[PDB]
Every structure is written in structure tokens, then in C-alpha cells.
Design a protein around this ligand. Structure first.
Ligand SMILES: [Mg+2]
Ligand SMILES: [Mg+2]
Lengths: 45, 183
């Protein structure tokens, strides 16, 4: 809980990714995850 | 007919987490990036750099949004152009065998975009932007950056020191799993 956004910013990119389709999917996944977290955070506000 | 002296290979083993056989394999990976620039005999102790453009386009880095920063951090002069020593050091730190405290230290350097020994709201803005390819709004980015500082700025100065960063990241269960390059 206490490092929710911190771990999203610093433990999200998988440095083993070496294919552009896999990379595209990961960017989409990360971005959607940030949006979900932002939605919950404003609700907490 | 040899790439290295025994002493040179002993020295690379001493300063990396690689076996002698791995140093040989990685040397050929480096030489193959620019075969008209990198000599095949390193007993001459050459002073040669592979340019960043060929490093960042390697299979192991080409899809990483932080590839330019990674090469900058490990390069001799901070411009991403790499000697053999720089290249070995980069893959050594990023290998699965590197200890977590060493990795956290270099992760800190990668994400400290302005190279001031701190991760501030501006450094965080760069990190979040690259992670989402600019698909969050500037306001959306600001919230994330502010939350990270709220969560992780332990000494309450508005920015992440190395100590702030290490306290946050050494807890994270997926740091070692994701901050890893295999070669
Ligand atoms: Mg900084
Ligand atoms: Mg601080």
C-alpha cells in the first residue's frame, strides 16, 4: 500500500522485453494501470 | 592469435559477475556491433568506443524506453558511446547475479535524468512520460509525481535522495524481476 505509485513508476518496465509488439502491449498495460490507480486515488480524495 | 591476455581476462572476471567464457561471448557481441571499428586483438589495449546509436539499437535494449539513459549512465563520458569496459559493466550490473543494492544504485542514476544526485518532480516527469509514451496528460503526470514524492520522500525535502530511493525500492517484490537484462 505505502509505495503504490512508487512501485508503478520504478518497477513497471520489464527490461527483458526485446520485441516491439510485446513492448507495445506493455506500454498499453502500464498506461491503463496508471489510469486505474489515478481513478482510485481521486476516489480516495 | 588471442583476443585478450590471461591478465586482462582475470581482471574482467574480478570486476564483473561474468565467467571467463561469458566475457568472451560478450566481447564478440560488442565487436559485432561495429566490426570495422572494434579490433579483434585487445592485447593492444585500444581506446575504442562503439557509438550510442549502435548500442541503443541492440536487441537487448532497442525496446527499452530508458535505453538512452542506461547507455549514458554506463558510458565513459555520459554520452552513451561505450568502451568494452563500459559494455561489460552495463550487462554485469543488469545481470541476474548482481546484488540488489548495486542494482538500486544504478536504477537511481538512470532515473535521475538531470544528474544532480536526486530524483525530483522533473526527473519523475521524464520517467512517467517515457513509461507511458506521452499517453497521460500533463495534469495526470503531475498527480503521479506528487504521489511518488508523498510516498517515498522520507527526509521531506521535496525530492528523492539515494537513501529515499533505496528505502522505497528494496521493498518492492518485482524490482529484481523487472530490472534485469539477460545476454
Ligand atoms: Mg535529478
Ligand atoms: Mg527526500
Amino acid at each position: 500500500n505505502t509505495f503504490n505509485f512508487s512501485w508503478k513508476v520504478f518497477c513497471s518496465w520489464d527490461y527483458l522485453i526485446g520485441n516491439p509488439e510485446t513492448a507495445d502491449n506493455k506500454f498499453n498495460s502500464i498506461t491503463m494501470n496508471f489510469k486505474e490507480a489515478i481513478i482510485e486515488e481521486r476516489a480516495a480524495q | 592469435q588471442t583476443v585478450f591476455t590471461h591478465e586482462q581476462l582475470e581482471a574482467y572476471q574480478d570486476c564483473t559477475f561474468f565467467t571467463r567464457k561469458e566475457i568472451m561471448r560478450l566481447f564478440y557481441r560488442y565487436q559485432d556491433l561495429a566490426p570495422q571499428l572494434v579490433p579483434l586483438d585487445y592485447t593492444t589495449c585500444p581506446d575504442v568506443k562503439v557509438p550510442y546509436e549502435l548500442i541503443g539499437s541492440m536487441p537487448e535494449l532497442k525496446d527499452n524506453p530508458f535505453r538512452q539513459r542506461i547507455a549514458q549512465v554506463f558510458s565513459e563520458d555520459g554520452d552513451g558511446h561505450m568502451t568494452l569496459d563500459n559494455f561489460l559493466d552495463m550487462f554485469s550490473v543488469m545481470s541476474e547475479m548482481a546484488p540488489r543494492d548495486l542494482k538500486a544504485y544504478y536504477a537511481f542514476k538512470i532515473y535521475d535524468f538531470n544528474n544532480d544526485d536526486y530524483i525530483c518532480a522533473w526527473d519523475l516527469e521524464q520517467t512517467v512520460t517515457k513509461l507511458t509514451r506521452g499517453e497521460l496528460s500533463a495534469e495526470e503526470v503531475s498527480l503521479v509525481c506528487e504521489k511518488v514524492l508523498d510516498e517515498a520522500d522520507g527526509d521531506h525535502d521535496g525530492r528523492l535522495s539515494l537513501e529515499d530511493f533505496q528505502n522505497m525500492i528494496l521493498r518492492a517484490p518485482d524490482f529484481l524481476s523487472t530490472f534485469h537484462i539477460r545476454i
